[PDB]
Amino acid sequence: RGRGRGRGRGRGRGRGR
Amino acid sequence: QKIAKTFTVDVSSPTENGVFDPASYAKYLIDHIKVEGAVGNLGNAVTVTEDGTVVTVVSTAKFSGKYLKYLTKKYLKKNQLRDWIRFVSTKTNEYRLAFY
Amino acid sequence: AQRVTFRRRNPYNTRSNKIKVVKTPGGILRAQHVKKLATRPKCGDCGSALQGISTLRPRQYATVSKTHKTVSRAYGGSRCANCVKERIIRAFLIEEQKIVKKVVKEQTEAAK
Amino acid sequence: AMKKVEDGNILVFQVSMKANKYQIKKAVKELYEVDVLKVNTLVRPNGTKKAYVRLTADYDALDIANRIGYI
Amino acid sequence: AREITDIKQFLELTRRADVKTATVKINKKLNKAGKPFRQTKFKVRGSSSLYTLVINDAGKAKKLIQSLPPTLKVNRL
Amino acid sequence: AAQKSFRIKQKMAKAKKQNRPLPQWIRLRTNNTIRYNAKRRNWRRTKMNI
RNA sequence: UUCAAAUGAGAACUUUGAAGACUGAAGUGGGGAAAGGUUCCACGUCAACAGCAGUUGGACGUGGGUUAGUCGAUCCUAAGA
RNA sequence: AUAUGGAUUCUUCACGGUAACGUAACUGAAUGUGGAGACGUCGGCGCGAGCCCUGGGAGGAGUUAUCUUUUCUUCUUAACAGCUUAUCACCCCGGAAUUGGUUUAUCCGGAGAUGGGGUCUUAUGGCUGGAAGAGGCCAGCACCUUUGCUGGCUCCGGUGCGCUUGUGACGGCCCGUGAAAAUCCACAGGAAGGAAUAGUUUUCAUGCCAGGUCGUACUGAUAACCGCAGCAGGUCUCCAAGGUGAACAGCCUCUAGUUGAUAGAAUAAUGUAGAUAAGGGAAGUCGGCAAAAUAGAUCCGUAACUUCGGGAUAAGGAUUGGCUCUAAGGGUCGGUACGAUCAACUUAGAACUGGUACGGACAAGGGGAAUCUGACUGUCUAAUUAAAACAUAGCAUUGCGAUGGUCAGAAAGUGAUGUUGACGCAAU
DSSP: OOSSSOOSSOSSSSSOO | OOOOEEEEEEOHHHHTTTSOOHHHHHHHHHTTOBSSSSBOOOSSSEEEEEOSSEEEEEESSSOOHHHHHHHHHHHHHHTTOTTTOEEEEEETTEEEEEOO | OOOOOOSSSOOSOOTTOOEEEEEOTTSSEEEEEOOOOOOOOBOSSSOSBOSSOOOOOGGGGGTSOGGGSOOSSSSTTTSOSSHHHHHHHHHHHHHHHHHHHHHHHHHHHTOO | OOHHHHHHOEEEEEEOTTOOHHHHHHHHHHHSOOOEEEEEEEEOTTSOEEEEEEEOTTSOSHHHHHHHTOO | OEEOOOHHHHHHHTTSSSOOEEEEEEEEEEOSSSOEEEEEEEEEEOSSOEEEEEEOOHHHHHHHHHHSOTTSEEEEO | OOSOOHHHHHHHHHHHHHOOOOOGGGGGSTTOOOOSOTTOOOTTTOOOOO
C-alpha cells in the first residue's frame, strides 16, 4: 500500500529469480 | 520679526495645600532652560517673573510649550511630586497645576 | 502601516478590478474601485487622435451635450482637420481634370 | 423585529414566496390604510420571506402595530 | 453640491416653488494673517442639488437674512 | 459559495428544519416503536451532497 | 510557560489581571474564489465527542440572525455546444 | 411623462475666431461611412497617488540615581460639482549652411526646423462647494440611573536612484505582430416638417414619477474544503511597517493575532537531532558516502583550448572594526560679473586606537589535470530506475496540382488537414 511493506520489485531483496 | 510669546502657569491650586513653593520652582527654570546650546544664555531672550500665585515666562528665542512641560515634570520628580500634581493646559499657552 | 481589502466579491487583479488607496474623512485608509480609463477618439484614415472631442466611455457619450462631441467645421468629429483639407484639393482638381479630359476626347472624333 | 418598530418606523411581516415588492406595497397600503415609503425583502434560511415595510412620516409604526393586535 | 456666486441669482432660487428647507451656517475663520472674522454660509436645499452662497463680510450677512421669504423654513446653524 | 442559486438555498432550508430531535410526546403514544431520530444529519459526520 | 484572583462538587487546561514569549508583516494579520451549509450569535447543559482533563467548545438542547435602481447574477460574445 | 424659463425663427432651421477651434442651446428620416468597446512582452525615463522619513507648533502619555529643548502618540477630508491645469498633437507669422534643435537612450527640419504668438485633450494635480455640522485629540462638569452637558484644538512645511501602484511618451523582440460581440457616438446624406401676431427644439436649465426577480451570515484551513478524522498532506488570489543588508534572504521589533500540540519526576544503556576533538590526513570504503574546508565586498592577477562569442568568480593573493578629519561629486535667486542660501548618501584619501581583532551573529563558490558519453535550454516511468533515454535546431528522402495526397465515419446532400496550395500539407 504505502512506502513500507516492500516485497515485490527489489534491487537485491526478495522476489528475485 | 521675532515677536515673543508669553507662557503663564497657574500655581494657585497646589500652593493652597502647602505642598508647592512658587519661588523655589521659578528658580529651577532659571538654571535649566537651554538657549543656543548649554545652560546660561539668557541674554535678553527668556525672562521668568512671578507674583506669588502665577509664573509668567516670556521668551523670544526657541521656546515651545512642550519644553515648559518637560522641565516642569522634571521638577516634580526631583521633589517626589509626580503622584498628586499634573501639568494640564486650560487653553493655548496657559497652563495650570491640578492637585485633586 | 495600514492594509486594506477588496470592496467587491472579485478577489483577482483583473483589468476591471483596479484599486486606488484613498484617505477617508474618518481617518483610515480605504480602497476605492476605479474604472478603466477612456481612450481618445481617432481619425478614420490618419490614425491620430482628433482634437476638440472629449474622451469618455462610449455609453456616457449620450449624456454629454452636443458641443463636446463635434466641431463646427464639416466632417468635424470624424476627420483630422488636415484630412478634410486634403480631400478638398482632390475633389476640386479631379473634377477640373475630368472636364478638361472630356474636351481632349472631343478632339479625336472631330478631327481624324 | 419589535425593536425596529419604535425607532425605525419599520413594520416586519411574513410574506408569501410568490409576492414581489409591488404586491407587498399594494397589499399593505389597503389592508391597514397606510402609506409605504420603501419595501425591503429577504429570504430567511428556513424557506420563508421576511419584508421590512417602512411607513412615511405622516404615520407612526407603534400606534398601528398594536392596532392589528400584536406587540 | 453646487456653489452660487451671485446674490441676485441666489434670491431667485428661494422662490422656485419647491425649496422648503434652508440652512445658515456660521464659520469661525481668519483673514490673510491677522484677526479672525465671521464667515457665513447660506445653503438652500433644492430637489436635485444643494445650492450654497458664502459671504465673507458680516455687513452683508445680516442684510440678506431679512430679504429671505418667510414661507421658507430657515434652520439656524 | 455565498453566491448561490435559489435551488441550492431551497434545499438547505429543508435540511435545517429536518435537523431536529424526536419530539417528546410521540414516545407516549399507543403502540409506538420509535425511540430516536434515525435520519439525523450533522455537518461534521455526513455531507448531504447538495 | 509562570503567579494570583474569580467561578465551581471538582481547575496543569475556563475567565480576568500581571509576567515571560512567539508568528515578524511572501504573518499564526485583514479580506475573498472553489467548496462546506448554519459551523455565525445568545442562553442553558456535560451522558456521549474534543485519543489527558474540562466549569470550556466548530459538542448537546432551545432560539435569534443574511434588508440593494448604483455590489453580482440577469445581457454580450470566445473556444465550443 | 409634460410644464416653466431660455435659445432660434419676418434672411425661416444660431454666432464668433485668418487658422487650430470656441459656446448653456443652436430641426435631420431611408441609407452609407468612421470611431470607441478593442488588447503582447520586456527595458529605462518622466509625472501622480498612498506609504516610509523629517522640521516648526498645539495637546496627551512614558522615563528621570544621573543624562536627555527627550521617547511615543493625535493634528483626517469621500463619491460628486464648478473653475483651472500637461507630455504629446495641431495652427498662424516667419524662411534656416558659418547646419541647427534635442533625449538617460539620435531622431527631427524647404514635405518648412530653431524662434515668436496661439489651439486642444483634463489621466493627474490645484482652489472652492460637498464640509465640519463629521470624525479625531484633550479639558471642565454633572452621576445608581435613560446617562449626557459645556469648552477648546484639529495648523504650517520639507525631502527622495526610497517601497507599492497608476499612467505618459519611447526603445527592444518575433518565420510568434499578440480575441469577438452586444452596445454607444459622430459624420456623410437631404427625405420630411416647419415663422409673424406666431412657432420649433425635452442633445439648454429647472421641475414630476418609477426602477422588479435571485444571491448577501460564517470558515476559506496545523479544527468549518478534499484526504474513513479535529490527519505535519493537498488547494486560486488581493493588501505588505521599522533596523541591518544589494535584496520580498536570514535575524530583531511595531500594528494585529496566538501562548493551542496529555503532564509530572529523574538524567542508565541503545537511539533520533545538533556538536567538539590531541598526532596522522582517505591508511576507511565497491566508491572522499557523510562531514569538513572555500564563501560577501574592494583591489591585484588569470593558462591550455576555442565555433573568437567564451573558458573566467579560471587558477592564485591582499585589504575589511572603531574614532577624528580631509577632498570630490548639486539645487535655487536678483546680473551680460560673482556671491548668498538650501538639501542629498556616494566615492577616494590620512592620522589615532586594540590581547592582530574586524563580510566578528546571521548570510555565504572547494579547486585543478584528463577519459567515456549526449551538442546545449528542455521532457518522461504520480508511488523504487532523471539517464548515455526522448525531444531539439540542422540535414536528407518520399507522396500530392484539388475529379488530389494523408486520415476519419455503420451510412450520409458526412468530415480533419483546409480561414490550406509546393518557401504548402502529409509520411519517415
